[PDB]
Amino acid sequence: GPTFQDVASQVFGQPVGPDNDGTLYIFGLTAKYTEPEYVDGRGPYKSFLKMLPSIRWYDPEHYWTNGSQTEGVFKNEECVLCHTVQTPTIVNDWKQSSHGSKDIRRGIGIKKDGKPVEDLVGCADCHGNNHQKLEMPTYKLCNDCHPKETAEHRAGGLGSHTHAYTVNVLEFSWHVGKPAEEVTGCAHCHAIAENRCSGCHTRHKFDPAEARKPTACRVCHMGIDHDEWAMYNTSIHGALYEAESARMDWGKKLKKGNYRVPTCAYCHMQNGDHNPQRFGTIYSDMGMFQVDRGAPKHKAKRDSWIKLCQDCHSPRFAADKLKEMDAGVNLSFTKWREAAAVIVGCYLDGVVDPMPEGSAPDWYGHYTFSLLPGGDPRFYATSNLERLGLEMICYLTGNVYKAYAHMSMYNQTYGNGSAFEQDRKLVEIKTEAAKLRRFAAIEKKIGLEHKSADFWKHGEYLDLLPGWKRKPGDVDVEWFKRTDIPHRANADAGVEI
Template identity: 90%
Template sequence: MLDILKKPLSRIAFAITGISLLACTMGNGIAKAEGPTFQDVASQVFGQAVGPDNDGTLYVFGLTAKYTQPKYVDGRGPYKSFLKFLPSIRWYDPEHYWTPGSQNEGVFKNEECVLCHTVQTPTIVKDWKKSAHGNLEIRRGLGVKGKDGKPVEGTVGCDVCHGNDHQKLFMPTYKNCGECHPKETAEHRSGGLGSHTHAFTVNVLEFSWHVGKPAEEVAGCAECHAIAENRCDGCHTRHVFSPAEARKPTACRFCHMGIDHDEWAMYNTSIHGCLYEAESATMDWSKPSKKGNYRVPACAYCHMQDGNHNPQQFGTIYSDMGMFQVDRGAPKHKAKRDAWIKKCQDCHSPRFAADKLAEMDAGVNLSFTKWREAAAVIVGCFLDGVVDPMPEGSPPDWYGHYTFSLLPGGDPRFYATSNLERLGLEMICYLTGNVYKAYAHMSMYNQTYGNGSAFEQDRKLIEIKTEAAKLRRFAAIEKKIGLEHKSEAFWQHGEYLDLLPGWIRKPGDVDVEWFKRTDIPHRANADAGVEVHHH
C-alpha cells in the first residue's frame, strides 16, 4: 500500500494546492524553473521517487514521471529543420524512410519465398494465393495482358513487389504498382490540392496541425495521409488487393471519419447508408461501379465513377474540408452541378437531384451566417484586448508568431491558445465543415440535430458568446478597480507547452525553395514573406 493512502487528506490537498505557488515549468530549456519541479513536490506528497517515464515504473497518476522523448527520425519538406516523425513512418512513406532490416541473407526465388512465409507469415501467403497476383485462374479470367499485349501466364510473385535479395528488400509504393497499373496510377496522381495525390506531401508536411505538435501525438495523421498518397493498399488491402473490397464504403471509412471530416457518419446515416446495411450481403461487389450494377450507391460508385482512381474528379468544389464557403450551385460551377445531377439520374429524377443539391447550397450558406456571427464576437474581444490569454501570453504558434489565430499570419489551433479561439476553431472546422458533409450525403438527421449539425452550431455559438460575455465583464470589473490583468504564466509554459515547435523554430528554418516547386499545389501559409520572431 502506497504511503499516499495513509496521509491525511488535508495534507494532500494542501500540498497539491500549494504547487500552484511554485515555478514548476519543465521542458527544453525555454524557461528553466528555479526551485523544485512539480515532480519533486509530487514525490514528497505521494512518497514515490521521480524517474523517467520509459523505465517501466508504475507512476501514481503519472505525477512523479519525467517525460522522455522517443526516438525520432528527421522530417522532410519545408520545415524539415524541426519537423520529426516516429520511426514507424518507414511503413507509410517507404520511398523516403524505408531501410532494409532483415536478419536473413540470400537471394531467393518466389517459390522459396512462399515456402518460408507459409510458416513465418501464413496469412500473407493465403491472401496472396487468393489474389489476382497469385492465382492464375483469376488472372486468366480477368484477361490480364503483359506489355507485349499477350495474356500473362505467370504470377506476380513476392520478388516483383519486394525484391528477391533479403538484405535489400523494399516496401512498394504507388510507383511500383504503376509498373503494371499505369492507368490507375496516373489517375491517382492527377488530383489537385485536397486530393489523395498530395495528402501527405502537402497536407502533412505543410499543415499546421501536424507540424505544430510533437510527432507521437500526430503519428496517426501522418500515417493515414501517407497511405492515401504513397501506397495503393489503403482501399484494397494487401495481399489480396481485392477490387470488391475497395468498392465497399467500409474501405473509405478508415480515413473518412471523425469529428473533423465525418463523411462516414454522414453516409452511414443517410438512406443510402441504411440501404447499404440492408442490401450489402446480397450485392455482387465483383461488378464494376457502373450504372445498373448496384441498387445502392457506395462511396466508389459516386466518387470513383467507372473505376477512375482520382476521386477529386467527381467531387464538388474543394473548400478545405468545408471550412471555406462557396456556393456550388452558382452559374460559374454549372458544369460540376450538371455532372452530379446526371450521376444522380442513375436512380433519381433530375428535378429531385437538383432540389436536394439546392437544399445543400442553402444549408451551407446559412451555416456560415452563424460562423461569421461567432467570428465577429471572437475578433471583437481580441481587438478590445480582453481575450485571456492574448497571443503574446500563449506559446508562439509553429510559425514562431504571436498572432491571433483567426487573423492572417496566425495559426488556427485548438491547443495552446485561449478558450475563445479554441471554441471558434471547433465551430468552423468540426461543425460548419460537417454541416456541408451532412447535406452533401443527404444525412437528414445530421443536417439538423446530430454530429456537426445546425443545432450543434447553435450550441457552440452560445458557448462562444457566453465566454466572450464573461471576458468582457471581468475586463470591466478590472478597469473599475484599477487592476491591470496579466495572463497567468501557465498559459505560456509547461512541461507539454515547452515541447511545441514554436519555441524551437528560428529565423531561416524554412526551406523557401520548397515553395518554388511547381509539381505540388502548396497550401496557403504564413511563411510567405513573414519572418519568425519570438519574445
C-alpha cells in the same frame, strides 16, 4: 522550485524517474518526459520537423532500410513456403489474389515493359529476391503493371490523395507544430492515401470488391472535422448499405445499373476512376470556405452530379436535393460570421484571456491572434475563445456541408456537425465573450491590473512546442518554390506559391 514530479513523488512515495524505464507510474505523476528517437522529417520545415523511425513503412523511398535477420537470395516459391510458416496470413491473402492465383484472373491484359504478365506475381516480384535488400513499395511499383490506375491516383489536386502527405502533412501547421509522436497517425493516414495502393483494396488480397464498400474509405473519412462516413451511414443510402451488404453482389463493377445502393466508391470513383477528387465542384477546404455549388458558373458540375443521381432517381429530385445543400450551407455561414464577429471583437477590444502574447508562440514563432490573417487557427495552446472559434468553422460549419451532400436528415439538423450544434456552439462563444468582457469591465473599474496566468505560456507539454525554436532562415523556401506540387498558403513560406 522543484518539479511537479518531485512534489508528487514525496506525496505518493514513488520515486521520480524517466517515463521509458518500464516503471508503472501512479497516475503518471512522477514520470519525466523523455524525447523518443527521431529521424528528420522532410518538406519546407525539415530543419526541425521530426518523424518517428516507423515512417520507414509509409515514405519508404526516403526512409526504408534493410532490417531483416534472414539472409539469402530466393525464388518466389521459396518465399511462399517459408512465409507459409512465418507470416501465414500474408501467404493466404496472396494465394487468394489474382497475383497469386491464375484461376481468379479476368484476362484484363496486364503488361510489363510492353509484354504480357502471364505468370504469378509473387513475393519476390514486388519485394525483391535478396532478403537483405528487401523493398517496401509505393505506387511506383504498381505503375509497372497498372499505369491507368496509377496515373489517375496521381492526377488529383491539393486536397486529394495525390498530395495528402507530400503537401498536407509536410506543410501543415497542426503537424509541424506538434511533437512527432503526437501526430504519427496523421503522417500515416495521409501517407497511406498518397504513397500506397492498398488504402481501399488492402494487401495482400488486393480485392476490388472490398474497395467498393464504405469500409474502404471510413477509417480515414470519419470524425469531428470530416464526418462523411457518419453522414453517409445516417442517410437512407447508408441504412440500405447496412441492410443489403451481406447478400448483395459486390463483384459487379461500379457502373450505372449494377447497384441498388450507392457507396463512396460508386459516387466518387465513378466508373472506376482512381482520381475521386475530380467529380467535386470545387475544393473548399473541407467546407470551411463558402461556395454556392448551384450558381450558374458551376452548372457543368451540378449537371454532372444530377446525372450521377439519375442512375437511380429523377433528375428533378436530385436537383432539388443539391439545391437544399446550397441553401443549407449558405444559412450555416451566417452563424459562423456571427461567431467570428464576436471573437475578433474581443481581440480588438483586448479582453481575450490570454491575449496572444500571454500564450506560447504559435508554430511560426509568433505571438499572433489565431483568427487573424497570418495566424494559425487551432484548438490547442490557445484561448478558450479561439478554440471554440476553430471548432465552429472546422468541426461544425464544414460538416454541415458534408451532412447535406450525403443526405443525412438528422445530421443536417440535430446531430453531429449540424445546424443545431452550430447554434449551441454560438451560445458557447457568446458566453465566453461575455465572461471575458465582464471580467475586463470589473478589473478596469476597480483598477486591478490583470496578468494572464503562466500556465497559458509554460508547462510540460507547452514547452515542447516548436514555436519556441523558430528562428530566421529555418524555412526551406526552395520547397515552396517548387511548381510540380501545389502548396499551402503558410505565413512563413517566403515566396509566391
